[PDB]
Design a protein around this ligand. Structure first.
Ligand code: CL
Ligand code: CL
Lengths: 187, 187
């Protein structure tokens, strides 16, 4: 049975941190559902790229659970995720069933907002460190990708391939990640 | 007056090679038009990410000319660009007015198809080299990014940041490219 990923897409998401993980995960044979936080309608991202979700989050939740829940970053994206009760429930349930949660850039600040994975070693965008560390609910890390149990974090658009490949490795193993990596012409 | 970019988006385009350049160029203050080869309707990319163009190519052509025409890659994407008479005209006119043309991955094979920039030093995805070099109409290069006059080429998803930043540098200069680069957390 193919592994399955839920990518939650909010208005103002960083489109690179959305698309690179979706594409790389799909190359790995993961069944990815791009779920629109605000329904099925096209989502305007942080640099005005417009992406059409596969489904509403409502409908995607019904087809769960997933092997990973992925939170893209972007300022407004992460704010929208942070304010969503529906996201709070999905993350709580995922942590409960001991499922992977992966967040990049400002994405991890939605973990803070929803009290997810307190005590975890995490990274964020440098500019989101102070926000993430407010209240001392995590240990901060400078690693481009950080994985502490079922909490996988990363730093920015430029770490998106490394982030996506860490998810692949976590779900599908090192050999599949190497396969996916081979034609990407990464440095 | 802001510099302006035309990104031609065809069914089967590599979504990473589309989104990374659009986002990075917009961060640089370039006015980017994502033009759907087949009108304004949402475009299904190579890994099934669906992107909504800003305009049809028809309408975008009328708002030209642009400082750069960008061709994303992907197998079917590049095939669709290669078969389009409308693309042939846009590229011919751009070469004529001594404007920049930038193509990544399989994207450069649309240059071959439309007899654009013959004699140029070019790179492509490794797997597209034989196709590009059929008839000996270019000199091949292994550089992650290649720029020979107004023909700028690159190799794959993993060279997309370098490709996007080379376009920025070409249009807006090294200082703006450094500015855009700074928060990306590139290696
Ligand atoms: Cl290997
Ligand atoms: Cl500098």
């Amino acid at each position: 049975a193919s592994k399955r990923a839920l990518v939650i897409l909010a208005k103002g998401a960083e489109e690179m941190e959305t698309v690179i993980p979706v594409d790389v995960m799909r190359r790995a044979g993961i069944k990815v559902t791009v779920a629109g936080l605000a329904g099925k309608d096209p989502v305007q991202c942080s640099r005005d790229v417009v992406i059409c979700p596969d489904a509403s989050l409502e409908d995607a939740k019904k087809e769960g659970p997933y092997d990973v829940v992925v939170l893209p970053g972007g300022n407004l994206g992460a704010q929208n995720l942070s304010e969503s009760a529906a996201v709070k429930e999905i993350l709580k349930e995922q942590e409960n069933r001991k499922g992977l949660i992966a967040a990049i850039c400002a994405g991890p600040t939605a973990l803070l907002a929803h009290e997810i994975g307190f005590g975890s070693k995490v990274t964020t965008h440098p500019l989101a460190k102070d926000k993430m560390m407010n209240g001392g609910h995590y240990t901060y890390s400078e690693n481009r990708v950080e994985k502490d149990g079922l909490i996988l974090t990363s730093r920015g658009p430029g770490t998106s391939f490394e982030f996506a490949l860490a998810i692949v490795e976590a779900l599908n193993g090192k050999e599949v990640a190497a396969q996916v990596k081979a034609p990407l012409v990464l440095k």
